[PDB]
Amino acid sequence: MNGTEGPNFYVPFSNKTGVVRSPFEAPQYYLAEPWQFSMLAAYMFLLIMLGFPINFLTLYVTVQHKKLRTPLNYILLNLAVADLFMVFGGFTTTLYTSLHGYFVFGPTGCNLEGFFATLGGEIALWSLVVLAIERYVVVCKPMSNFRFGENHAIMGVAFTWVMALACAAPPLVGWSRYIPEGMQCSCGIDYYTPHEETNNESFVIYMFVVHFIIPLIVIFFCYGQLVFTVKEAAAATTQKAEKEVTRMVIIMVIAFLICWLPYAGVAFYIFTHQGSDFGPIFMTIPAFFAKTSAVYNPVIYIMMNKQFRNCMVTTLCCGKNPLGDSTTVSKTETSQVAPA
Numbered sequence: 001m002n003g004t005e006g007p008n009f010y011v012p013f014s015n016k017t018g019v020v021r022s023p024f025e026a027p028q029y030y031l032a033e034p035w036q037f038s039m040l041a042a043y044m045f046l047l048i049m050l051g052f053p054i055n056f057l058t059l060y061v062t063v064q065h066k067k068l069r070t071p072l073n074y075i076l077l078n079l080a081v082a083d084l085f086m087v088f089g090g091f092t093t094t095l096y097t098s099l100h101g102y103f104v105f106g107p108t109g110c111n112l113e114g115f116f117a118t119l120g121g122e123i124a125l126w127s128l129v130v131l132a133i134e135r136y137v138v139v140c141k142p143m144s145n146f147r148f149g150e151n152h153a154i155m156g157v158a159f160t161w162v163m164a165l166a167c168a169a170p171p172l173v174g175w176s177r178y179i180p181e182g183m184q185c186s187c188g189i190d191y192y193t194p195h196e197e198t199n200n201e202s203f204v205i206y207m208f209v210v211h212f213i214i215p216l217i218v219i220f221f222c223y224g225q226l227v228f229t230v231k232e233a234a235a236a237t238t239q240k241a242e243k244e245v246t247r248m249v250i251i252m253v254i255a256f257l258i259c260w261l262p263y264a265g266v267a268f269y270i271f272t273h274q275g276s277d278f279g280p281i282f283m284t285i286p287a288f289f290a291k292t293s294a295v296y297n298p299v300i301y302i303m304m305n306k307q308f309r310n311c312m313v314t315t316l317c318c319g320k321n322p323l324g325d326s327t328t329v330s331k332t333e334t335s336q337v338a339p340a
């Protein structure tokens with residue numbers, strides 16, 4: 001056999017040398033060198049040191065500036081939060097693991113690690129479907145009359161949390177499960193073994209279809225309609241606003257892919273070629289690289305949303321003077337409404 005199946009794991013290392021051992025009981029240093037682990041540990045340490053402030057600041061600024069209530073500002077508050085969950089929920093355990101060499105906290109540390117990453121990535125995917133719509137109703141405007149009040153914005157955010165849970169919560173209760181991957185420092189869904197005892201085979205399709213293919217077809221086709229109205233470049237007059245938020249909601253989709261396609265791809269490969277011959281390094285790269293999903297969203301936001309960027313500077317400068325190159329929002333300053 002080219003892997004070592006366990007009742008809890010599956011190390012992608014042969015054990016015709018009795019060197020293999022439970023990623024929940026001893027260092028996996030025979031899978032690679034002790035420094036590559038120190039790399040993962042340094043790398044995660046930086047991810048935590050970065051995703052934390054970026055996401056926390058984002059959260060903070062959104063709430064402090066009382067006029068940042070568009071559905072988009074809503075969605076990003078959501079991501080900023082989900083992201084903070086990953087940071088503490090999972091990255092905490094994935095850092096301690098990479099350090100001490102194995103899932104020293106057993107399956108729990110593994111479900112923390114694995115659960116909070118899925119929760120975080122699916123929330124991002126399902127959020128992208130919300131934006132894919134909120135974006136459809138503003139450009140290819142349907143009803144001769146409509147705009148999303150915070151009313152409907154709190155709807156789509158509550159939604160991404162149901163869908164995300166529908167996908168990440170099951171493995172914690174008996175449908176599929178979180179098992180360590182790569183150098184065994186991160187935990188993912190079970191693609192490795194059939195384990196009829198929990199039905200991993202069923203879930204993995206449930207997930208690849210209900211939580212990957214479909215949201216992707218939705219998000220892709222919806223875009224095919226928004227291929228005339230708001231063309232694709234960038235640089236009333238209130239049209240260059242929604243014509244710009246859109247170019248953002250689109251760079252968010254490129255990024256999601258860049259992040260999960262390589263993982264999802266390797267994950268689907270495994271499922272299809274279970275028990276074949278792959279190494280620990282195989283999935284360690286797309287798995288760990290995807291952990292940057294806990295921080296790129298706010299970066300895109302702060303760079304593609306002139307409005308938020310200044311609101312961020314405004315909070316950071318306590319007062320103002322945001323060296324810009326259009327409307328507003330804040331607190332005791334000009335957070336006054338200007339509707340109709």
Ligand SMILES: *[C@@H]1O[C@H](CO)[C@@H](O[C@]2(O)O[C@H](CO)[C@@H](O[C@@]3(O)O[C@H](CO)[C@@H](O)[C@H](O)[C@@H]3O)[C@H](O)[C@H]2NC(C)=O)[C@H](O)[C@H]1NC(C)=O
Pocket residue numbers: 004005006015017018019020021022
């Ligand atoms: C690869 O093959 C190895 C041997 O061929 C397996 O190693 C062991 O089976 O590991 C167990 C640990 O569970 C050892 O038995 C001990 O440790 O069991 C209890 C732990 O619950 C201890 O308290 C006792 O002291 C036992 O020694 C075995 O000694 C050891 N086998 C050997 C080297 O003879 C190894 O698990 C296997 N890899 C896999 C499939 O994970």
Ligand SMILES: *[C@@H]1O[C@H](CO)[C@@H](O[C@]2(O)O[C@H](CO)[C@@H](O)[C@H](O)[C@H]2NC(C)=O)[C@H](O)[C@H]1NC(C)=O
Pocket residue numbers: 001002274275276277
């Ligand atoms: C062990 O791993 C090897 C490497 O994949 C498996 O060999 C291989 O996959 O076998 C399939 C059919 O069984 C061939 O079509 C293919 O050519 C092989 N891959 C190569 C290029 O070596 C082998 O099947 C695995 N054994 C198991 C299931 O434990």
Ligand SMILES: CCCCCCCCCO[C@@H]1O[C@H](CO)[C@@H](O)[C@H](O)[C@H]1O
Pocket residue numbers: 066067068069070071241242245337338339
């Ligand atoms: C997408 C760029 C175009 C901006 C319009 C979309 C978001 C609408 C924000 O509306 C404002 O929300 C405030 C509460 O947050 C209300 O107090 C205020 O009366 C209302 O007018």
Ligand SMILES: CCCCCCCCCO[C@@H]1O[C@H](CO)[C@@H](O)[C@H](O)[C@H]1O
Pocket residue numbers: 232233234251254255
């Ligand atoms: C982190 C996410 C990475 C996404 C990077 C996306 C940047 C690619 C932008 O494309 C370019 O936009 C110009 C303006 O419209 C076009 O004139 C040009 O032909 C097109 O190639």
Ligand SMILES: CCCCCCCCCO[C@@H]1O[C@H](CO)[C@@H](O)[C@H](O)[C@H]1O
Pocket residue numbers: 233234235244247251296299300303304
């Ligand atoms: C990590 C994600 C950040 C990468 C940014 C993705 C490339 C999109 C570039 O588009 C341009 O950005 C300018 C901001 O200076 C806008 O003023 C301009 O109208 C817009 O067309």
Ligand SMILES: CCCCCCCCCO[C@@H]1O[C@H](CO)[C@@H](O)[C@H](O)[C@H]1O
Pocket residue numbers: 261262263264265266269277278279282
């Ligand atoms: C869009 C990015 C998605 C990435 C998906 C990558 C999955 C392809 C894996 O290929 C296989 O890897 C094995 C060991 O690594 C080789 O032994 C085998 O010959 C090779 O065919």
Ligand SMILES: CCCCCCCCCO[C@@H]1O[C@H](CO)[C@@H](O)[C@H](O)[C@H]1O
Pocket residue numbers: 030031032033278279280281282283285
């Ligand atoms: C994205 C790259 C795809 C490659 C997938 C297989 C990589 C497996 C690497 O294995 C490791 O190589 C070290 C140096 O040879 C050995 O010391 C160690 O024991 C072995 O476990």
Ligand SMILES: *C/C=C(C)/C=C\C=C(C)\C=C\C1=C(C)CCCC1(C)C
Pocket residue numbers: 113114117118120121122125186187188189207208211212260263264267287288290291
């Ligand atoms: C380091 C830990 C990781 C990456 C753990 C778990 C991730 C998943 C189970 C991923 C789910 C997927 C996402 C977020 C995006 C589309 C579908 C999917 C299965 C690839």
Ligand SMILES: *C(=O)CCCCCCCCCCCCCCC
Pocket residue numbers: 316317318319
């Ligand atoms: C509200 O407006 C908050 C004030 C923001 C001021 C930020 C000052 C930055 C700190 C300067 C550090 C310079 C390097 C010092 C090295 C010893």
Ligand SMILES: *C(=O)CCCCCCCCCCCCCCC
Pocket residue numbers: 052053054056057313316317318
């Ligand atoms: C306004 O006074 C000029 C801006 C310079 C001060 C801003 C300091 C740099 C921002 C660093 C971000 C850290 C925020 C931490 C959030 C938890």
Ligand SMILES: [Hg+2]
Pocket residue numbers: 131132133135136219222223226
């Ligand atoms: Hg769209």
Ligand SMILES: [Hg+2]
Pocket residue numbers: 255258259289290292293296
């Ligand atoms: Hg990314």
Ligand SMILES: [Hg+2]
Pocket residue numbers: 307308310311312314327328329330
């Ligand atoms: Hg602002």
Ligand SMILES: [Zn+2]
Pocket residue numbers: 007008195197
């Ligand atoms: Zn079992």
Ligand SMILES: [Zn+2]
Pocket residue numbers: 122163164165166167168210211
């Ligand atoms: Zn989901």
Ligand SMILES: [Zn+2]
Pocket residue numbers: 193194201271274
């Ligand atoms: Zn199978």
